[PDB]
Design a protein around this ligand. Structure first.
Ligand SMILES: CCCCCCCCCCCCCC(=O)CSCCNC(=O)CCNC(=O)[C@H](O)C(C)(C)COP(=O)(O)OP(=O)(O)OC[C@H]1O[C@@H](n2cnc3c(N)ncnc32)[C@H](O)[C@@H]1OP(=O)(O)O
Ligand SMILES: Cc1n[nH]c(C)c1Cc1nnc(-c2sc3ccccc3c2OC2CCNCC2)o1
Ligand SMILES: [Cl-]
Ligand SMILES: [Mg+2]
Ligand SMILES: [N+]
Length: 384
């Protein structure tokens, strides 16, 4: 029925647009007309402005997400974004603290809901638009199906519109009106044995434990011998290499140098970026972020460490050789599995590099934007 989504400027379930349509649902919006009152919460709940730079406010958001955020379909894994990852994800250039919105239960003073946005320039079918990237919408498990989520959504929309921004980008595993693209995820086992023991991977009479371990063995030698952790001197080179690469896609963020520095400079247990420099020029890059999942009800293991393919560009090797090196660098950093979406050129290497198809897919959405949908190979952005 989508009783809430149908009141919003997003496509109806049956809407399909020609490649030539690329425009808002509602144009000529006026900042002066935006509501100045906060949306009403049910009795006993209050808005709270989170300070993600304050360790203790950041720890509250962390706890709320650790306990109540996204699980896989079978409720075996729940994402466990670290506190330091949340700092990086929310404090990108020109971020607004007022777009990091909590909801507390007054009587306990406990955070029970959150939603966030950061500003980014998004190019959709060759038109670049200032947008908000929305993420970390979460309502405590005890308060589900009370229609709190549309309150969170309408309040962040209002605060975004105060900044004269009228479009947003977001991703979800659930189907909503109406994806612009849908990308399945794939997984490449690194610590085979652990993945078998927690239920993620399987054996059979052909594939015994020892044979599974040998199937996924990797050689500890890079195809691109000089691939090294990115350093601040590499920001201009990464900006040129990535910025050029991304223009081929139907949907991508347009990064400034500031943004390159924030989204790529390495941070242990958060973001890993490697580069290959030749004559002071960056010719190849690999990047993946750390997103562990908490393992629910396994006696032996509590955490699955997982590296998430982010942006990868090669000019001196084949894309397969580059992604093989990305797997190796993940293995060198203690990750159990390497996860990738079928975006950009990724799908082309999955069979050869022994990726297995996962359980589900990630839907990409835009708010207040009408356009043709497209295959995920034409998606050139990866959200957190
Ligand atoms: C111009 C600026 C524009 C800015 C805003 C752009 C839009 C931003 C939109 C947000 C983007 C976030 C992206 C992002 O964070 C990444 S996707 C991860 C979302 N978070 C989780 O899955 C965490 C675990 N689940 C929860 O915490 C709750 O189930 C949530 C809070 C999801 C819903 O709480 P609830 O207690 O289960 O449900 P009610 O309160 O009763 O609300 C039901 C209404 O919520 C609609 N719903 C459910 N899940 C949704 C989802 N993932 N996106 C959008 N809408 C979602 C649902 O269809 C229904 O509407 P309908 O009746 O029409 O069908
Ligand atoms: C809960 C869980 N534990 N382990 C799994 C697999 C899942 C299910 C799942 N949901 N999204 C995904 C994937 S794979 C993936 C691979 C590369 C890049 C992004 C993603 C991605 O999305 C990102 C970005 C949007 N925000 C959530 C995380 O994977
Ligand atoms: Cl309303
Ligand atoms: Mg609710
Ligand atoms: N996301």
């Amino acid at each position: 029925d989508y009783k809430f989504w149908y009141t919003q400027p997003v496509p109806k379930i049956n809407d399909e647009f020609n490649e030539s349509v690329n425009e808002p649902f509602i144009s000529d919006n006026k900042v002066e007309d935006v509501r100045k009152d906060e949306y009403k919460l049910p009795p006993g709940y209050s808005w709270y402005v989170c300070d993600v730079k304050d360790e203790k406010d950041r720890s509250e958001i962390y706890t709320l997400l650790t306990d109540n955020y996204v699980e896989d379909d079978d409720n075996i894994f729940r994402f466990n974004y670290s506190a330091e990852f949340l700092l990086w994800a929310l404090t990108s250039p020109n971020y607004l603290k007022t777009w990091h919105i909590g909801v507390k239960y007054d009587a306990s003073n406990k955070l029970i809901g959150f939603i966030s946005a950061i500003p980014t320039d998004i190019c959709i079918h060759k038109r670049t638009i200032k947008m908000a990237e929305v993420n970390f919408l979460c309502v405590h498990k005890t308060l589900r199906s009370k229609r709190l989520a549309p309150v969170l959504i309408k309040e962040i929309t209002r605060r975004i519109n105060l900044e004269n921004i009228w479009q947003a980008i977001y991703t979800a595993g659930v189907y909503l009106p109406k994806p612009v693209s849908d990308a399945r995820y794939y997984h490449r086992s690194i610590n085979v044995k652990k993945l078998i023991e927690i239920g993620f991977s399987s054996l059979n009479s052909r594939l015994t434990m020892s044979r599974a371990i040998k199937l996924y063995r990797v050689e500890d030698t890079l195809n691109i011998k000089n691939m090294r952790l990115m350093k601040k001197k590499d920001v201009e080179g990464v900006h040129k290499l990535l910025g050029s690469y991304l223009e081929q896609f139907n949907l991508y963020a347009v990064f400034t140098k500031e943004e390159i520095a924030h989204w790529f400079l390495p941070i242990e247990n958060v973001i890993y970026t490697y580069v290959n420099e030749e004559n002071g020029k960056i010719k190849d890059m690999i990047s993946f972020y750390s997103l562990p999942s908490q393992i629910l009800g396994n006696d032996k293991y509590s955490t699955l460490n997982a590296a998430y393919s982010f942006y990868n560009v090669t000019t001196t090797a084949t894309f397969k050789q580059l992604m093989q090196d990305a797997i190796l660098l993940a293995k060198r950093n203690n990750f159990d599995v390497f996860n990738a979406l079928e975006v950009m050129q990724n799908k082309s290497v999955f069979e050869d590099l022994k990726f297995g198809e996962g359980d589900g897919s990630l839907k990409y959405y835009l708010y207040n934007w009408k356009c043709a949908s497209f295959a995920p190979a034409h998606v050139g952005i990866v959200l957190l």
